[PDB]
Amino acid sequence: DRDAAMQRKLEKMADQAMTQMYKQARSEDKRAKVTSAMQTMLFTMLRKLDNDALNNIINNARDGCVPLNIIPLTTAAKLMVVIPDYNTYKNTCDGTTFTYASALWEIQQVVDADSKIVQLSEISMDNSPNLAWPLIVTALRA
Amino acid sequence: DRDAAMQRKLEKMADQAMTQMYKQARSEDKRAKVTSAMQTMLFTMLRKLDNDALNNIINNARDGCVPLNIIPLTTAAKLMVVIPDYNTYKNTCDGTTFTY
Amino acid sequence: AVGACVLCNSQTSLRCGACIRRPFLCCKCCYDHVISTSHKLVLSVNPYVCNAPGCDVTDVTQLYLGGMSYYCKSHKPPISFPLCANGQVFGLYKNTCVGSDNVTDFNAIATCDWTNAGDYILANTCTERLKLFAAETLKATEETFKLSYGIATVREVLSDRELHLSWEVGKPRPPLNRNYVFTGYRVTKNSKVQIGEYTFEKGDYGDAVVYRGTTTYKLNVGDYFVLTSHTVMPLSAPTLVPQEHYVRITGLYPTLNISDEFSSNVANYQKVGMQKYSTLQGPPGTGKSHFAIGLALYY
Amino acid sequence: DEGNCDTLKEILVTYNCCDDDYFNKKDWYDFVENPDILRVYANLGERVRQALLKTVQFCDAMRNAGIVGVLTLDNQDLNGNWYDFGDFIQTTPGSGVPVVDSYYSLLMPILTLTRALTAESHVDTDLTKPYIKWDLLKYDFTEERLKLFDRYFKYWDQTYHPNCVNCLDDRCILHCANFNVLFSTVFPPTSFGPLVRKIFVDGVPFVVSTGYHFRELGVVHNQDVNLHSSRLSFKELLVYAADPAMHAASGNLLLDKRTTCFSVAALTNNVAFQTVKPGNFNKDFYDFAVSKGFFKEGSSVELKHFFFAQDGNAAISDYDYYRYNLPTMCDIRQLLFVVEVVDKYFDCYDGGCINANQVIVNNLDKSAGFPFNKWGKARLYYDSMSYEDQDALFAYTKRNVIPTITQMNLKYAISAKNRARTVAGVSICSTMTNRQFHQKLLKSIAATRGATVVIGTSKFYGGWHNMLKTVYSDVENPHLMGWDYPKCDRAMPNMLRIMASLVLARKHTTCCSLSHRFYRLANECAQVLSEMVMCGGSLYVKPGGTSSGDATTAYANSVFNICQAVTANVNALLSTDGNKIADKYVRNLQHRLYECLYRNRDVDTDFVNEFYAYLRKHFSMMILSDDAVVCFNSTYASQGLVASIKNFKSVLYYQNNVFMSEAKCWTETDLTKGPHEFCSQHTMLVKQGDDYVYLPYPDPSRILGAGCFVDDIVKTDGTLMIERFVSLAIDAYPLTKHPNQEYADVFHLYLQYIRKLHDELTGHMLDMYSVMLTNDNTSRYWEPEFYEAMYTPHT
Amino acid sequence: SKMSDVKCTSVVLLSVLQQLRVESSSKLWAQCVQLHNDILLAKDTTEAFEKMVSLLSVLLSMQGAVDINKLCEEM
Numbered sequence A: 001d002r003d004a005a006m007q008r009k010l011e012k013m014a015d016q017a018m019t020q021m022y023k024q025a026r027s028e029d030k031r032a033k034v035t036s037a038m039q040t041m042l043f044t045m046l047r048k049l050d051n052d053a054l055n056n057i058i059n060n061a062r063d064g065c066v067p068l069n070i071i072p073l074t075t076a077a078k079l080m081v082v083i084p085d086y087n088t089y090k091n092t093c094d095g096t097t098f099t100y101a102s103a104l105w106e107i108q109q110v111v112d113a114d115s116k117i118v119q120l121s122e123i124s125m126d127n128s129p130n131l132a133w134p135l136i137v138t139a140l141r142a
Numbered sequence B: 001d002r003d004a005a006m007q008r009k010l011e012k013m014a015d016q017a018m019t020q021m022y023k024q025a026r027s028e029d030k031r032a033k034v035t036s037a038m039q040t041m042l043f044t045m046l047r048k049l050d051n052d053a054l055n056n057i058i059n060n061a062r063d064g065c066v067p068l069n070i071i072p073l074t075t076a077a078k079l080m081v082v083i084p085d086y087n088t089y090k091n092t093c094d095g096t097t098f099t100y
Numbered sequence C: 001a002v003g004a005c006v007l008c009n010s011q012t013s014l015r016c017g018a019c020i021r022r023p024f025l026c027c028k029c030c031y032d033h034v035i036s037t038s039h040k041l042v043l044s045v046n047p048y049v050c051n052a053p054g055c056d057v058t059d060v061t062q063l064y065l066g067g068m069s070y071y072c073k074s075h076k077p078p079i080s081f082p083l084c085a086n087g088q089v090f091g092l093y094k095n096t097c098v099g100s101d102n103v104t105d106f107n108a109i110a111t112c113d114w115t116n117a118g119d120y121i122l123a124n125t126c127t128e129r130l131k132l133f134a135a136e137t138l139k140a141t142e143e144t145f146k147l148s149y150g151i152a153t154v155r156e157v158l159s160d161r162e163l164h165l166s167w168e169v170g171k172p173r174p175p176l177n178r179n180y181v182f183t184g185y186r187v188t189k190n191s192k193v194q195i196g197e198y199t200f201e202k203g204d205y206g207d208a209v210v211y212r213g214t215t216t217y218k219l220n221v222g223d224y225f226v227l228t229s230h231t232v233m234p235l236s237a238p239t240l241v242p243q244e245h246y247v248r249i250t251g252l253y254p255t256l257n258i259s260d261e262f263s264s265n266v267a268n269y270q271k272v273g274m275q276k277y278s279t280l281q282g283p284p285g286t287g288k289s290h291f292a293i294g295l296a297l298y299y
Numbered sequence D: 001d002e003g004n005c006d007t008l009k010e011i012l013v014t015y016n017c018c019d020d021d022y023f024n025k026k027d028w029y030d031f032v033e034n035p036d037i038l039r040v041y042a043n044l045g046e047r048v049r050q051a052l053l054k055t056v057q058f059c060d061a062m063r064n065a066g067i068v069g070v071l072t073l074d075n076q077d078l079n080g081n082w083y084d085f086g087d088f089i090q091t092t093p094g095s096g097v098p099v100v101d102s103y104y105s106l107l108m109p110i111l112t113l114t115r116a117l118t119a120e121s122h123v124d125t126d127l128t129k130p131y132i133k134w135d136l137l138k139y140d141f142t143e144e145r146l147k148l149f150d151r152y153f154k155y156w157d158q159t160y161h162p163n164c165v166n167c168l169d170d171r172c173i174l175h176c177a178n179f180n181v182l183f184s185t186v187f188p189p190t191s192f193g194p195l196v197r198k199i200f201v202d203g204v205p206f207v208v209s210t211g212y213h214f215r216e217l218g219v220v221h222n223q224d225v226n227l228h229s230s231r232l233s234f235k236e237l238l239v240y241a242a243d244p245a246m247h248a249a250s251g252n253l254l255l256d257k258r259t260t261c262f263s264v265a266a267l268t269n270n271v272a273f274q275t276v277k278p279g280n281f282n283k284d285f286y287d288f289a290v291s292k293g294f295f296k297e298g299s300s301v302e303l304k305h306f307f308f309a310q311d312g313n314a315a316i317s318d319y320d321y322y323r324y325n326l327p328t329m330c331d332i333r334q335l336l337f338v339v340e341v342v343d344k345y346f347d348c349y350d351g352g353c354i355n356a357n358q359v360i361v362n363n364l365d366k367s368a369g370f371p372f373n374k375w376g377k378a379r380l381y382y383d384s385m386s387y388e389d390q391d392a393l394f395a396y397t398k399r400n401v402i403p404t405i406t407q408m409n410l411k412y413a414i415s416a417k418n419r420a421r422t423v424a425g426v427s428i429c430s431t432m433t434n435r436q437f438h439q440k441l442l443k444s445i446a447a448t449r450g451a452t453v454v455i456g457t458s459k460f461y462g463g464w465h466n467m468l469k470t471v472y473s474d475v476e477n478p479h480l481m482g483w484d485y486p487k488c489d490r491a492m493p494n495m496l497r498i499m500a501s502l503v504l505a506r507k508h509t510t511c512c513s514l515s516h517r518f519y520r521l522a523n524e525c526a527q528v529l530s531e532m533v534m535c536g537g538s539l540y541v542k543p544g545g546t547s548s549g550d551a552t553t554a555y556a557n558s559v560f561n562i563c564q565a566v567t568a569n570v571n572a573l574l575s576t577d578g579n580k581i582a583d584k585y586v587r588n589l590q591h592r593l594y595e596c597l598y599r600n601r602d603v604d605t606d607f608v609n610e611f612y613a614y615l616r617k618h619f620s621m622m623i624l625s626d627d628a629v630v631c632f633n634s635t636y637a638s639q640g641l642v643a644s645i646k647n648f649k650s651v652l653y654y655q656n657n658v659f660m661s662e663a664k665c666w667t668e669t670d671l672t673k674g675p676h677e678f679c680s681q682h683t684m685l686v687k688q689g690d691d692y693v694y695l696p697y698p699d700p701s702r703i704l705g706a707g708c709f710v711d712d713i714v715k716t717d718g719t720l721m722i723e724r725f726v727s728l729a730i731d732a733y734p735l736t737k738h739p740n741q742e743y744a745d746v747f748h749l750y751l752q753y754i755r756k757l758h759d760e761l762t763g764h765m766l767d768m769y770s771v772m773l774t775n776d777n778t779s780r781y782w783e784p785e786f787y788e789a790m791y792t793p794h795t
Numbered sequence E: 001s002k003m004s005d006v007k008c009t010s011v012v013l014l015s016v017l018q019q020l021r022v023e024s025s026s027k028l029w030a031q032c033v034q035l036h037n038d039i040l041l042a043k044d045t046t047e048a049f050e051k052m053v054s055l056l057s058v059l060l061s062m063q064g065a066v067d068i069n070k071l072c073e074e075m
Ligand SMILES: Nc1ncnc2c1ncn2[C@@H]1O[C@H](COP(=O)(O)OP(=O)(O)O)[C@@H](O)[C@H]1O
Pocket: C261, C262, C264, C283, C284, C285, C286, C287, C288, C289, C290, C291
């Protein structure tokens, strides 16, 4: 019996050691997956960049440092306008072209809150009740 | 006493397993039958209320005289309702008046 | 899920993994099926594999319910207990599972490959639940036989009205007629996605198939075809709804001088009205498929 | 005081701010019910600003004439002229000195309420002329800030640092940050936020944030910036994925007209409209309840707490409430004394930095914020990072600023009002370092019994009675008082949040350097105070106010609550006459309080201790992060020597930009009834055993609603969740001592439902088998002794 | 218990509507949510019953969603 109880402790600590080893490893094969995912996300975001416009605005910077809030506002090629009602639509982007951020944008698409396509003739004062507001208009920099 | 203790010990783990498996099976199952259970519960509660307007619209819906839009509450608001046969028209429509 | 045993309709939570249809089986019936046949995989709410770090044991007499999961002989927590024992297989509703022997016909139904002829004469003279299970597994086997077929490709197109065919080397070639359809692939780099629903038929001269499509896509030579599969749904409803003999016609109404041509089958129309279901057997071209239209003119 | 405001109405009318019928509106003064009042107050701004300019002339006229004197607000009319020279003594010309310490400091809350410096946004400082078109790439307005300071606050003689990285301590960070709050209102809103820079790693150009431009803290640059790298470690990958530089630089431009908040970018190609589901109805419990006589017509107990559903325009309608956060310039000579008193309140605890192996996380299966929730929970990032590269990240945050995106998450919970509730899911890169920075002090606060901040004090086993006996800590004429903070987390000024963060960081006097503490404060501001907010797949800018998801949320909220209470007491004591104060000790206390506010620049620790003793003796408090019970002296408060409800209303008006209606604030003249409500629990005095104790009972509607409505379909089975009802019966036990029988029947209803649930559970189990369970200890859950022992002080 | 009762029927009704993917049509889900919330915040029984009629009309208008005849024959 003295050499036995020791067997219980042996198997208990062996299972604990094996579980600890599995946890330390599975956790090492789950770390590489998230490292690869973060790398792919960062490099796709790199490939999305408007390199010429960003290069221009960053070379104009004296220190090489610019506010982040002007990076889209001066380099983004696509603008999404979310509009809650018809008066706002008439004010901000009525017509097929409009002006925002001291630039000229041309409407390329309009969708409703249901992600259904809306034509510019359907956005009227009388057809406003029949539209699922808000409307998301997507325009491209001209 | 050593023989008795071990049995109790095993049987306690048996009860643990039985309870845990039953909870898992019933929980996964309940989510499984939710739509029909919720609809039956809804119509049970609708019947228990026994409101005269709700009973009227439900009895018309059984006949197929369903609305096309939300029934409006404001006065002089527009209701569009499909009538599928002269039977449903004769009871509901008296002259130019429509009871619904 | 919680279900009902196929051959005794007791409550159960076990299924046979090896069976194509995965049928519910109560504890006693599952033990009788697994201890005698070659099927040794049982799915509870959790499958009965061994939960070691890595271990692959599925035979149910090898396993134990240890700690909080199913573990094999030398992976078990030191506290047992055996799963497949005491004449049963441990599952939910353990002490309410009572079946019957039909565990001699169910072995034959589950094991048989539907190659011989006697499998059908045992799949149609058994009890009523086995009449449904055998039909279900027969449809499942008929579907899984298509998995052993050879997938096509296109050789070229000299004539756009007659496709050229090329079967994969090392597999049987399906027959070319209307009953069989195909759906394609374009697996080059570059779209392992279907390209339409096509069908084939042979040509008299040389090697050619005068095909047909649901759309009008052409096949750049890499595009090819595979015969489409069909998962088989549970045989939910009984084969024949049980018969009741009404005293008088209920739910149906006669007619006023039905016609001068259907005046002979009136008694059979009334008999149809009286019973829940009726069967009309007659030699061909005696008035069977016209009896139905006369019935329509009578009701 | 909205009941007595006749000089404010007369001032507004006589200077054409409004039309004397504007006050016929029901709540014209309310900042959140009538935001147009801001437009009215700003009509005074150019009259205030001219006054400021007049002062700088008058000061000069004294300085060149050799005339020494104190400038007071009561010697300057609203035109701006000065007329009281009685206490002016003349010295040699060219060497006079105007003392403008109390002039400017009392005026400071009015310089932003009236938006006095809006004429500085116009070219040539002319309100008719168009706005100044600043260069977009410009972010360093240090010379502009210095010109503003030398133009308006010229003779304010304390040193001003436009960038608070040069401040000498946290008493200097608050002063210069208070000036920066004012001066940042005249600069373009696009110039603040992270300052990005193009770096190269293994030859590919990243755009990463190498700094920040805070409206309060000025320009901050990172100290460890590697322009050329080769490999990115897991720590650097986490830093570059957390910050919004790449996400904003890659996403589309956004123009969201649904809000007035600054919209930065749209990350996806379409907007996400997240809805909120209704609750799941437990029909079995409701049938059981109505079979027991509940929910009758006219009954006192009725369903009022539900799961309210929300449409797709909910998350962006809740975020728009950050429109109630206005830039508030504080009284700095007063805030700098309130800080000392609050630090006296937080003197019994100990804190400092801990190692990564000493951090304990409660639940690791929690969201990691954006973008880290795309690959796992917080468990993934607490397992993937060793202690070495968690300490490396923490030491990185003491020399570099890491901006962070916080998600807005709609809350799916039971409530009595249909407005949507939103929480802030902060990134793991912020939560990890904030835990490592604050958790020692935070656990020290939660483990102290008998203090002002009751966090970590249970209400069970006599914990409620102990709390209420410590509140009544030998006050003379005790009255209980409780107030409300409307829009507390969204209207909190940035100065007060910075104050709370600096008070929490006073424990790091040995573990952190001065620059370490500044960069930790800057990380707090960049990740919590004014961050990028992900609301429906779109990045907006949070104007300010606390986010409810940072590591130190309840504790910083407690610091803010104590600060507002001390400010109310200071204002109450100073606004009293002084010739009417009969007690000669309180008159001298008022005299020395004014001296320590506006005539003293170094901390007088003796008087800070004396005022702390006065507040503890006469204004005893109990704080849980925005709930507060006060057991004040009623005679002193009637004489105006201690804060009242009206003082809290005044302080919240000029220092929170909210109106605290006295319909949400209660007063209890009888201590045998206890606080009216604290932590949503009413209190009643019961005879337990042989002695009378205070027990907390909830709203019976709340407990019945928790029983009837659930947030999951499987919580409706009942037999699966008997612990769910055991916990609810534990919470509903004290209702049995209520004199109203319909309240006392809720506990018995829960006990009877527990018994029915166990009966049908055993029936179903015996059906699923043919044997009962051998060991069943569930019989104790429908005996009331298991719940009676829950409120007995033996444990 | 009638007034108290309706407020639960509206909860079940909106749960059914959400299960029927009424949530996908934002213009309809806004009206359903408004009616549900205004039923829950009601003091008068007649107003709640009128709004319950309007909210049940959403369920009854969609023909292919639920089987009214089967559902009403289980009672
Ligand atoms: N009562 C009748 N009198 C004359 N001709 C009949 C009568 N019933 C059937 N027929 C003829 O017998 C044929 C039987 O057709 P059908 O019932 O389709 O045979 P089957 O059912 O074997 O296919 C019909 O084409 C019809 O022309």
